[PDB]
Symmetry: C2
Subunit: 205 residues, 2 copies
């Protein structure tokens, strides 16, 4: 049986990891942790991720080693398989750099656009504008980089995998990609990948 | 000097100066003014296209640029062999807690700073959101520090990434009351000579 257990949900951060597993050809078992039933607050899950959030993996081939944080899981799996991140000093760092730009920039800022534009009890246009403008600014950084190279770190890598599930939902966040020709190219390339398509359907709705 | 550091007196800048001081690597400091719009200067955009500090240029490695504080910490740890284990599990524990800082503590406490200190309007719902979340993340750190001395076990770049933020909790309007493990760790970090040195950079 699969030696990776995946705890996930249908969110951009969960899709980062299912896409990566699908790209790498790694078998895995899915646990769609039930937030409806408070499973993320149970002691059992908190021994895997003390933050009580998805995604998280348990590597059963490695003494049931737990890995939390989507970006840390991507690094762990890339290193395990030798795929989707170069091994030389500069190539590896370029991937980690763009991965961190996603983890500290794209994801947090676009997530706050989601909060204020879609979920917050009252409409705070100053906050909505702040995060929508910042997300667009980050998208323009991505677009400029994608004029220099086909993928963010050169060859396709876990950095692209981390970034795509957020860029994909730009309209939910109220942020446009129009005018960003290189980012649009990259979106179309990512969307056409079978492994991306499969990863986006995990966990089954 | 080996490393050229482009920085400012912010928590994210302090992560990297603290790391350099811990590792004993020679470096030069370029302090960038947010007022003079030095972040926007084209030469700096060639180093970090995001136009933010910190960034390094490794003069010992073909003037290779590294941006993103967390990625700089990883690059330097790997370069020197310090402050992150080389075994699979030890290395991953550091990366996990580093990502918790980069995706969680830094962004959320930074948003607390925005609405509590700098935003033009007082938006109490936004202040509460980010002060509550920052405190929740601090409680996660406190729980972990009850089972390990430092976040990944031994002292590592994950602690260096996290401390410059926790250090300014009162500026963000977030208390550490009741978090005895976090307070122990705060005192240990504050006492380290290299932490003290790195907090002085830039002047």
């Amino acid at each position: 049986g699969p030696m990776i257990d995946l705890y996930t949900a249908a969110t951009p951060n969960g899709h980062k990891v299912s896409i990566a597993l699908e790209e790498m050809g790694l078998p895995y078992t899915v646990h769609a942790l039930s937030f409806d039933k408070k499973e993320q607050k149970a002691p059992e899950f908190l021994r895997i991720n003390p933050n009580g959030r998805i995604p998280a993996i348990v590597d059963r081939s490695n003494d049931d080693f737990a890995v939390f944080e989507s970006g840390a899981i991507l690094v762990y799996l890339a290193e395990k398989t030798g795929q989707l991140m170069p091994t030389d000093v500069k190539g590896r760092s370029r991937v980690i750099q763009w991965l961190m730009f996603q983890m500290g920039g794209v994801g947090p800022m676009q997530g706050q656009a989601n909060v204020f534009f879609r979920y917050f009890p009252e409409k705070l246009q100053g906050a909505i504008d702040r995060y929508q403008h910042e997300t667009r600014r980050l998208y323009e950084v991505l677009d400029g980089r994608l004029g220099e190279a086909e993928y963010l770190a050169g060859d396709y890598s876990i950095a692209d995998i981390a970034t795509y599930p957020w860029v994909r939902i730009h309209d939910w966040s109220g942020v446009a990609v129009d005018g960003l020709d290189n980012l649009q190219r990259w979106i179309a390339a990512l969307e056409a990948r079978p492994a991306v398509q499969r990863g986006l359907l995990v966990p089954r709705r």
